[PDB]
Amino acid sequence: FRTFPGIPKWRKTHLTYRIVNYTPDLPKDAVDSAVEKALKVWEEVTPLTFSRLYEGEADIMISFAVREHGDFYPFDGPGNVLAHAYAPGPGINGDAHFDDDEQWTKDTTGTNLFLVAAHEIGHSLGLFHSANTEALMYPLLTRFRLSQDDINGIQSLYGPPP
Ligand SMILES: [Ca+2]
Ligand SMILES: [Ca+2]
Ligand SMILES: [Ca+2]
Ligand SMILES: [Zn+2]
Ligand SMILES: [Zn+2]
User: Fold this and answer.
1) After which residue numbers is the chain interrupted with C–N beyond 2.5 angstroms?
2) Are 156 and 45 in contact (CB under 8 A)?
3) What CATH code is carried by the domain that includes residue 137?
4) Measured between alpha carbons, how far is 72 from 89 in angstroms, rounded to an integer?
5) How much distance in Å is there from the Cα of 32 to the middle of ligand 3?
6) What residues make up the domain containing 135?
7) Cβ neighbours of residue 90 under 8 Å, at least 6 residues apart?
8) Do the Cβ atoms of 2 and 45 come closer than 8 Å?
9) Which backbone phi and psi does 62 adopt, to 5 degrees?
10) Would residue 44 show up in a list of annotated catalytic residues for this protein?
11) I need a labelling partner for 158 at 20 to 30 A (CA). Which of 3, 34, 89, 94 fits?
12) Binding site membership: which residues?
């Protein structure tokens, strides 16, 4: 596993998230479900806990965007970059943006929202890319399981569950 330079990590255990907008590709409940599941992946193996906001600034602001979207890193159309997320910290830090030029799906027929959200939330929590090909944090459904490498890395930052 890898962390970010200077090892930025959240200094508190309870983090908020907010789903700022919704893709046309999926029912809203499928977006909410995929996000909740993605957060749970990491909650299960650390002392981190999460709660959702519907107004104000949550630590992890989640949104869908296309091309230029209010930051220095425009998305690139279909394929290639699927989403991006910022390392822990204030403001834009922690936030996760999903390219709506992808076709987000609940299954594997398009780009699976849950898998990509789980990987991006890893970044939001302070893990950079792993060298292990089976890790969620490697740049790349019934068989999904967080790898030990991912657990080792997230626990290196936040410890194991109490
Ligand atoms: Ca933030
Ligand atoms: Ca793209
Ligand atoms: Ca789309
Ligand atoms: Zn962005
Ligand atoms: Zn990544």
Assistant:
1) 140
2) no
3) 3.40.390.10
4) 17
5) 16
6) 1-162
7) none
8) no
9) -115, 130
10) no
11) 34
12) 25, 59, 69, 71, 76-77, 79, 81, 84, 91, 93, 95, 97, 99-100, 102, 119, 123, 129
What is the rounded end-to-end Cα distance, in angstroms, of the chain?
Answer: 22
DSSP string for 61-130:
EEEEE-SS-SSS----SSSS--EEEPPSSSTTTT-EEEETTS-EESSSSSEEHHHHHHHHHHHHHTB---
Contact 81, 116 (CB under 8 A): no
The conformation of residue 141, written as its DSSP 8-state character, comes to -
Reading the block at residue 25, the tokens are 């590709």
Q: To what resolution in angstroms was this structure determined?
A: 1.5
Tokens 């330079």: give the residue.
5
State the number of CA atoms in the 13 A half-sphere of 120 facing the CB.
27
CB-CB neighbours of 117 under 10 Å: 25
Domain count, the chain: 1
Q: Which of 36, 68, 120, 134 is catalytic?
A: 120
